[PDB]
Amino acid sequence: SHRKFERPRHGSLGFLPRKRCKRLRGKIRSFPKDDKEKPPHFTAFMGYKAGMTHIVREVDKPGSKLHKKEIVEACTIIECAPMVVVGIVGYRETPKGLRILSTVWANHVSDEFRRRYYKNWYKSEKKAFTKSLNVPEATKNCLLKRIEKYCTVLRAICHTQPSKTPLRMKKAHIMEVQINGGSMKEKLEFVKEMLEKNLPVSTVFNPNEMIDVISVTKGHGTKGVVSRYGVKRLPRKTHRGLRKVACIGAWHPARVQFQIPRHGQKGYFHRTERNKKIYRIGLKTDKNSASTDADITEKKITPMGGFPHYGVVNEDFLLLKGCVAGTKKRPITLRKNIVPQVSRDALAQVSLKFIDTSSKIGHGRFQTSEEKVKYYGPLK
Template identity: 35%
Template sequence: MGKVTGPRHGSMGYWPRKRAKRQYAKINAWPESKDSKLLSFAGYKVGMTHAILTDNRKNSTTKGDEINFPVTIIECPPIKIAGINLYVKDAYGSKIKSCVLGKCDKELGKKICLPKKVDEKKIEDLKTENYSDVRVLVYTQPKLTGIGQKKPELFEVAIGGTSVEEKLNYAKGILGKEVLVSDVFSEGDQLDTHVITIGKGFQGPVKRFGVKIRGRKSEKTKRGPGSLGPWCGQQHIMYRVAHAGQTGYHQRLEFNKKLLKIGEKGDEINPIEGFKRYGVVKNTYLLVKGSVGGPTKRIIRFKKALRPNKKYNYEAPQIQSLNLRVAKDVKD
């Protein structure tokens, strides 16, 4: 019989528990911003370590002291703008009315069919009349990293701004160009991370839902649900019952992760042997407070906080040291 404090195991907010459609997440909700710039970026997860920081939280009992925090390292090579999506709004929601592609790298041809010629006149003639929103198509450059991947990821990113015309002018200005993570975020910002978690394959109900292992004298099974629910006849079982199935490789969102540092040189943090299961950081990197989902080498999408903490301290703390064997220190 279920307890009042724990009537069931497994949140129904994450249903169905099946594999994600693709290896990088989709963002459906975007924050509002008055600044004309991208609202999201992407990078590749390097791994985790811990850092010694000077605590700058206002009401903390350890304010001013050096404390230990876990941090996640994310490598962020520049992203490129592939095209512009123009939306119209009707009674059923927003739909893409027009899409214009700019000059793209040949690697993107592994993902989509690229036009032979770029229609510059069509891009210049774009107007905001009859359009409700403007977003851009961006693609990553994994060839700049050491993960061994050439095929880029392609996804849509919203633009901040006070009007559709302002967004369109900004999109025209960056079309076909590179955008750095420092152009989008700054140290101390709050981030929402969108990831595809580590896949664990087909697992039983104890690992998948955390149901209790039954007693020694239980019949039929020990590592399973105690009841199959009110409808378990006629070859039917209710979907709410904890059963074995796919575990992991789900899309998950975490709110309000703190961006501690934006580093320009990967040599500052690279060990001599490189990071385990990743290699060497060659591009701009981020230090994010706490853990971020997904395995190493997986792409992490992050955006400006959708519902930021109002009591948040936007000043980035001073990092005293990282738990890394930096190459130049070992050689000396």
């Protein structure tokens, strides 16, 4: 017979095989659609998560209750040291999917790029990328002409620089960045100019832009149905315990269906989130990178006492409104929107009035470490 009272289903069947992910790195599944009328440009980047803080901002929404008020909002900070471009790969379309012609490498590569090919670098002869860099440039140019003639998609291989962070890891992370823009020849020309240089993050994105985020959530281990799916909790009189689902199914479909919630692993899942807005792109050549027009105190982004569980931020960074999946030190991938948005919030530009840099250990009370010594006077 029918269930007595209706209620919507508990979980979401769209994230269903709740298993651990294959990797730390967030992978882009699809790229934005190539508009061949724009000039060639990059589409993605990668950095590391540092921590959170809050700011004060004025509102410009006519008709809202908050139309002329300063309000507080929470933001996340991502460290964005520059990447290095080291290779070119070209794809072509076949009825079995995209297919590779060849890969072309730069003339020199670094040791943190080479460490990524070794389980244990300290006990090796270090012979990776030693014979294939002496290739004559004539062969490389012939291969590039073939790529120009037969291909349809370019991507660029780039890697990060963990030595400029407080990380313990030394292997660099490697990823491919698709390049949209003009014709195939223009794309190839655009790429070749960068085969051994750095990408600053400010080249790829703009202030007040809207961006998508890809990363891996925090891990928790084995968790019960009550915590994993949020089912009801069961009366205190129950004999074998109360933290479970009472009925697994009707008699006669004589099996358990895949829609029933069960125990198992929770956390460490792969996610893609949309519409995170950029509030400030700070640099490392700037001494007052956390000061505003309305607060001329000279300041950097790092709170008093270090970012808890991370360290100090002394490269250029992004400031994002809201929250991002992952722990501290988790690598974050940054993609452009699939198609650009023209809404009232996607175009509006933001002016900041205050950024908080008080301590996040305990309950902070001062904005700089000089205020602390100025308040107390001499000690013992």
